[PDB]
Amino acid sequence: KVFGRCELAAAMKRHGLDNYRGYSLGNWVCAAKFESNFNTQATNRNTDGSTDYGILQINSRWWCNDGRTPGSRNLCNIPCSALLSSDITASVNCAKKIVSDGNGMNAWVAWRNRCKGTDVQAWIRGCRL
Numbered sequence: 001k002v003f004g005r006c007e008l009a010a011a012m013k014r015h016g017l018d019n020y021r022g023y024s025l026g027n028w029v030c031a032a033k034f035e036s037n038f039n040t041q042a043t044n045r046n047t048d049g050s051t052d053y054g055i056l057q058i059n060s061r062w063w064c065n066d067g068r069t070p071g072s073r074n075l076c077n078i079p080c081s082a083l084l085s086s087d088i089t090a091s092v093n094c095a096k097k098i099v100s101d102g103n104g105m106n107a108w109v110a111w112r113n114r115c116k117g118t119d120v121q122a123w124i125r126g127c128r129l
């Protein structure tokens with residue numbers, strides 16, 4: 001599923017991401033935009049052989065199991081294919097764990113490079129929330 005901007009902000013809000021660990025909703029939406037273009041089905045292979053999955057491009061190196069990343073962990077205790085559902089719940093819960101590990105949102109390279117220090121509120125401007 002490809003979410004619309006406002007539609008995803010609303011889902012993220014309902015799932016408890018608004019100001020989660022101090023990151024306002026615009027950060028999550030901006031992250032989602034640049035990681036996946038709001039596509040829940042996004043997969044991208046990394047140079048190391050791991051794969052990033054779903055709307056927030058969660059990596060199999062650490063966070064989920066895809067059966068093909070030798071020596072990786074599954075810290076969110078989920079199959080990576082759960083991160084591809086049209087329902088964002090698992091990507092959200094896994095994101096909460098990631099973002100609480102010490103690096104905050106810097107875990108997402110595109111957030112550091114494209115959203116961090118920008119007016120992220122623009123990403124939720126005009127949405128009914």
Ligand SMILES: OCCc1ccccc1
Pocket residue numbers: 033034035036037
């Ligand atoms: O910003 C849209 C360009 C983009 C497409 C696919 C994945 C991330 C970004």
Ligand SMILES: OCCc1ccccc1
Pocket residue numbers: 005122123124125
């Ligand atoms: O208005 C739509 C969302 C948006 C926010 C910031 C930059 C480009 C687009």
Ligand SMILES: [Cl-]
Pocket residue numbers: 024025026027120121124
């Ligand atoms: Cl915001």
Ligand SMILES: [Cl-]
Pocket residue numbers: 065066067068069070071072
């Ligand atoms: Cl594996």
Ligand SMILES: [Cl-]
Pocket residue numbers: 021022103104105
């Ligand atoms: Cl932080």
Ligand code: NA
Pocket residue numbers: 060061062063064065066069072073074
């Ligand atoms: Na893994």
